[PDB]
């Protein structure tokens, strides 16, 4: 009490309020499932994300809509600051009707200074600058150097942005989503569970480092299309993508960070596999690979080939499945499998196993 | 088919020439010269604060120029700006992509950056007109994961992404002014010189390269590690730098001598290095080995000086204050201990 002062007590009160919201967000993040999604390039993860995350099932959250429209205003400010920089860094000088344009640039800096809300007079002076036909034709020349791809949508709708009434759409956040760099967080709700699918994709070449952050996870979805034995995705003479998938599952399922987290393995294209196994047998590939000529036992044998890649571990169980064109079955299997994983981990935490 | 081979032979000849040069100028090693200085043997530092409020595990931290505020990034979504002297939180920035691997703190105290797995560097403004912390800029010109972000001024940031290149940005413009691309592996760490004229960068191919921000060319290149590099920190004179790796070997490379000086390797460590920091004098060597505890090497005799134990998991990032008052370790047990 002696060391504390008025502002120190108010800072401790703010720290208690912050720690309270921190803990609330932490228990909200503990009431939700985070799960990884690795898949081969031949396999196809997009269709899995589209069937598991229905647009009609999960609408856009109203609370994040203010953050989304703030992103929209920030992209508008970025677009107009790129326009005034292009009219400042222009190699061949272009005549301007207003000499105050450069001061207008500073003015666009001044609205950059506050950035509280949309400034009406800033929209008016940007509209007056855009009224010049040379400023409109400058965008085609600005396409030459490094520029935002989703910039014409904001720079052509400047009068529509100038209206204070605004419409939130999934196309609006798709304009920011189209950059598609990095991991994608797809959020969907099912039976009071908040699933968060993290698909890392083929953006990054080497994974010796950034797999180590995925230690705290619940499931590992692993989508491989078993029709790849005849299909071609080869940077070398190894035409069989199935061996690539076997090495992938051997590197992931036997990894030191994933020694307690299970793998839900999805055989994606089974109808194409059925057609291509009725057309030609799997005996051509390898003899031991061909357990039986029939569809069913081979469909067992492939998943058996994934069951014995787990090197001696009994604390993680491969929940195998065959993907069909039904939204209910796949989401219900993910629900039941992740629920089983959560039950096993919490009972291991209790010590009952 | 033959021109590529003879250019490769010319490159091998140049590597043999620079190896013979650095061997020829290597008459007296540092460990032979430092046998007369008085060694420090008992460096016992006690934890003075254990910061609490992180649900998930820490990946980075960075001290301010005032030695009182320290940023910290974790996976729980909230990037927390701690006040060190009195344990209370100052800001908890909600991140968009919670899979962040780095953070920084501007030398003016205004901005705070963070990269992550989303291949984007989010720079936040703190001293703004409002009380919240808004997303100021989002530098998204990278392809690989970001590993270290550093602030030169409130206008220039240097980032180490995982697409085998570093960048040099202007913040308000949004585009990368300079692209530093000679690395072959994923670039893992940065270290700035105190005069902010040149920086070293460590990749996964054991090559620590010194880049110059003025021109944009690779000034120097160092290769002395068996495994991949995880962390680098300059010497406070700016003429040398320590470098960590997964081969349990800190190595102190020299700039004017253009080679390694000493090797801070013990025999009972089969554990990786995750972060490396120097004190103000540069006598100590704070090394975050991932055997659940930190270690204090002597940067002139390669002797151990103190184990900083007390973390339940891997120490992910540690930093010494800019005045030298303390050193804070952030580990995967979600704690931020301040050893003094």
């Amino acid at each position, epitope marked *: 009490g*002696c*060391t504390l*002062s*008025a*502002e*120190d*007590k*108010a*800072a401790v*009160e*703010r720290s*208690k*309020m912050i720690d309270r919201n921190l803990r609330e967000d932490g228990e909200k993040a503990a009431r939700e499932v985070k799960l990884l999604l690795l898949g081969a390039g031949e396999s196809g993860k997009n269709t899995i994300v589209k069937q598991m995350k229905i647009i009609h099932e999960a609408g856009y959250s109203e609370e994040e809509c203010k953050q989304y429209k703030a992103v929209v205003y920030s992209n508008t400010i970025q677009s107009i600051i790129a326009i005034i920089r292009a009219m400042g860094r222009l190699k061949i000088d272009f005549g301007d009707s207003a000499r105050a344009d450069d001061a207008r640039q500073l003015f666009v800096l001044a609205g950059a200074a506050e950035e*509280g*809300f949309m400034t009406a007079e800033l929209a008016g002076v940007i509209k007056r600058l855009w009224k010049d036909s040379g400023v409109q034709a400058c965008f085609n020349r600005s396409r030459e150097y490094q520029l935002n791809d989703s910039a014409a949508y904001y720079l052509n709708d400047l009068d529509r942005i100038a209206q204070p009434n605004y419409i939130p759409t999934q196309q609006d956040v798709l304009r920011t989503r189209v950059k598609t760099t990095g991991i994608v967080e797809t959020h969907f709700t099912f039976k009071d569970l908040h699933f968060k699918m993290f698909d890392v994709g083929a953006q990054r070449s080497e994974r010796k480092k950034w797999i180590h952050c995925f230690e705290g996870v619940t499931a590992i979805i692993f989508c491989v299309a078993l029709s790849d034995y005849d299909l071609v995705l080869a940077e070398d003479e190894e035409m069989n993508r199935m061996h690539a998938s076997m090495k992938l599952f051997d590197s992931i399922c036997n990894n030191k960070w994933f020694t307690d987290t299970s793998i839900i393995l999805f055989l994606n294209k089974k109808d194409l596999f059925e057609e291509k196994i009725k057309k030609s047998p799997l005996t051509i590939c390898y003899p031991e690979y061909a357990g039986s000529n029939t569809y069913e036992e081979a469909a067992a044998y492939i998943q058996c080939q994934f069951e014995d890649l787990n090197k001696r571990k009994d604390t993680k169980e491969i929940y195998t499945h065959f993907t069909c064109s039904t939204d209910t079955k796949n989401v219900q299997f993910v629900f039941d499998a992740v629920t089983d994983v959560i039950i096993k981990n919490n009972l291991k935490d209790c010590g009952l196993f | 088919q033959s021109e590529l081979d003879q250019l490769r032979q010319e490159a091998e000849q140049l590597k043999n020439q620079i190896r013979d040069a650095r061997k020829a100028c290597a008459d007296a090693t540092l460990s032979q010269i430092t046998n007369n200085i008085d060694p420090v043997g008992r460096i016992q530092m006690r934890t003075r604060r254990t910061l609490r409020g992180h649900l998930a595990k820490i990946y980075a931290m960075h001290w301010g120029t005032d030695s*009182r*505020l320290l940023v910290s990034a974790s996976q729980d979504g909230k990037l927390i700006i701690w*006040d060190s*002297y*009195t344990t209370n939180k*100052v*800001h908890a920035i909600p991140l968009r992509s919670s899979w962040v691997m780095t953070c920084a703190y501007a030398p003016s*105290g205004n901005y705070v950056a963070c990269g992550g797995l989303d291949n984007i560097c989010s720079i936040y403004n703190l*001293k703004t*007109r*409002e*009380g*919240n912390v808004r997303v100021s800029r989002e530098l998204a010109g990278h392809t690989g994961y970001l590993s270290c972000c550093r602030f030169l001024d409130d206008n220039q940031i240097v980032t180490s992404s995982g697409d085998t290149t570093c960048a040099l940005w202007d913040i308000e413009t949004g585009q990368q002014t300079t692209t530093f691309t000679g690395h072959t592996g994923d670039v893992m760490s940065l270290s700035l010189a105190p005069d902010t004229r040149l920086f070293v960068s460590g990749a996964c191919d054991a090559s620590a390269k010194l880049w110059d921000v003025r021109e944009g060319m690779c000034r120097q290149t160092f290769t002395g590690h068996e495994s991949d590099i995880n962390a680098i920190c300059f010497f406070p004179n700016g003429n040398a730098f320590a470098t960590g790796s997964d081969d349990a070997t800190c190595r102190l490379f020299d700039l004017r001598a253009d080679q390694e000086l000493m090797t801070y390797s013990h025999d009972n460590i089969i554990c990786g290095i995750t972060s490396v920091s120097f004190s103000k004098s540069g006598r100590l060597l704070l090394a975050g080995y991932d055997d659940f505890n930190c270690n204090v090497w002597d940067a002139l005799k390669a002797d151990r000086a103190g184990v900083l134990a007390g973390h339940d998991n891997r120490v992910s990032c540690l930093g010494v204050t800019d005045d030298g008052m303390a050193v804070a370790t952030g580990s995967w047990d979600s704690f931020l201990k301040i050893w003094n």
Partner: single-chain antibody
Amino acid sequence: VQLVESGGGLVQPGGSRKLSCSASGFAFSSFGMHWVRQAPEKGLEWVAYISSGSGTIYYADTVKGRFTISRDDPKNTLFLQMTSLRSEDTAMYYCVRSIYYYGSSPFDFWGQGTTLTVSSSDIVMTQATSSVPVTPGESVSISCRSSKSLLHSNGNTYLYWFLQRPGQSPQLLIYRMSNLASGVPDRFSGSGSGTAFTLTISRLEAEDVGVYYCMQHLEYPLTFGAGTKLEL
């Protein structure tokens, strides 16, 4: 940053009145809010304070119990309900923002000031000077004497300097008598050690005239200064 407060102006003494302050333009949900009286032809004086999230409420000694106060976060509004008004409460009321962290500038923004007229221990901040006539363009020195050593153990001396233009609202211009506020030009400096503090103006301008207040923020209640005015 817009604070518009309303309520009152012709109130019978002994009756209740509820004043509403709308807060638009900032994160109101994490701001402790203060109130400030200003009697006609007299100095400013503190009323009450609400912490962030309404955790800890403080009142002044002379208005304790008679007033009640509330914060509505989803509408971003602040309500001051005053019961059993006295004949000395005829004043202009200011509802001001405040945020408390290291390097923060609380009391930085001021309301326009609502008017409320009625029909009819403490750290005393003894400002000796009250009016200094001076021409524009010279160094001006305003002294502020306290009654308690404001130098706390943690090293920062909790005294703030405030500028109020004639016919306008007050404005924070110096916090903790070393640092300058976000928006003031680099002309105003603060010096002194614990007992006595000094505001030094390098060059004076047409916008630099007004009344200067000094506030101690070491202990509640926040007793203000008399207010030294500058005329030309």
